[PDB]
């Protein structure tokens, strides 16, 4: 699918104690490329992958300044929301923000988004048209009236249609050899007995990128999806991902089951079996 640039902000109040902490991470597709964390002294926006390191000092200065000012805004925001909900000043709360753009075939914004959450729940979000907001509750409706009167949606739209996509197309170039390379998973099937009438067959997918993948089991061409164990896709540690799908079968029917792996890194979808 289409490439995307996205940022994820987490602000956490520390009462008090008596300030916040603010963390930002930036991704291109499933690859983290920058981070900011004012838990560190003299905080700076910093590179998290080789290909971004080549940005000049002015970029890093501008990004740093920008996020530090954003951190201040979220510090104030936490105080404001505590007020909206008439909550105790002694408790810590979270304000999360999620925004990004997707690149279309014409090199323009395919679609963009901006979503915010308070204490882990939807608070306010920009609608698909990038021109109106959806408030989750009465408190968010106060924020909404402020953002409507302030032209926040129009600034967001211009960013998403402008700087966001422009930056994305740039990063995609800089990190060509890695961002635009599909890394197929290395696969195999393992067997793990249990009692006499149970045997776990596990289909592995290792070191793949991007994150999107399909692992399914079939019993003579019939899907076995409902008794299948599917783990959450997990980071390999090197920028790639891992995943596996297991299912218990009769200790003799091993040959009667097939694992099917679909990943854009493959030439053809795979069909694995236990040997």
């Amino acid at each position: 699918g289409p490439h995307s640039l996205s940022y994820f902000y987490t602000a956490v109040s520390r009462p008090d104690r008596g300030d916040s902490r603010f963390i930002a991470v930036g991704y291109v597709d499933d690859t983290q490329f920058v981070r900011f964390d004012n838990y560190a002294p003299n905080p700076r926006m910093e590179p998290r992958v080789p290909w971004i390191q080549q940005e000049g000092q002015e970029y890093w200065d501008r990004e740093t300044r920008n996020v530090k000012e954003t951190a201040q805004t979220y510090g104030v925001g936490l105080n404001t929301l505590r007020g909206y909900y008439n909550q105790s000043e002694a408790g810590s709360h979270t304000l999360q923000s999620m925004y990004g753009c997707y690149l279309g075939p014409d090199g323009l914004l395919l679609h963009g988004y901006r979503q915010d959450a308070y204490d882990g729940a939807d608070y306010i979000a920009l609608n698909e048209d990038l021109r109106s907001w959806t408030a989750a509750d009465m408190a968010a409706q106060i924020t909404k009236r402020k953002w409507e009167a302030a032209d926040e949606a129009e600034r967001r739209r211009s960013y998403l249609q402008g700087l966001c996509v422009e930056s994305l197309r740039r990063y995609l170039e800089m990190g060509k050899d890695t961002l635009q390379r599909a890394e197929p998973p290395k696969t195999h099937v393992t067997r793990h007995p249990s009692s006499d009438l149970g045997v776990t067959l596990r289909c592995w997918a290792l070191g793949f990128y991007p994150k999107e993948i399909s692992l399914t089991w079939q019993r003579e061409g019939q899907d076995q999806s409902q008794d299948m164990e599917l783990v959450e896709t997990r980071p390999s540690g090197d920028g790639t991902f891992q995943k596996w799908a297991a299912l218990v079968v009769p200790p003799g029917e091993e040959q009667s089951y097939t694992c099917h792996v679909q990943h854009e890194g493959l030439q053809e979808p795979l069909t694995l079996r236990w040997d």
């Binding site: 920008n66 000012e69 805004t73 925001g77 404001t80 304000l95 402020k146 953002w147 967001r156 960013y159």
Partner: peptide
């Protein structure tokens, strides 16, 4: 590149 600070909540 990051967006500028959002409006106040």
């Amino acid at each position: 590149a990051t967006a500028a600070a959002t409006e106040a909540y």
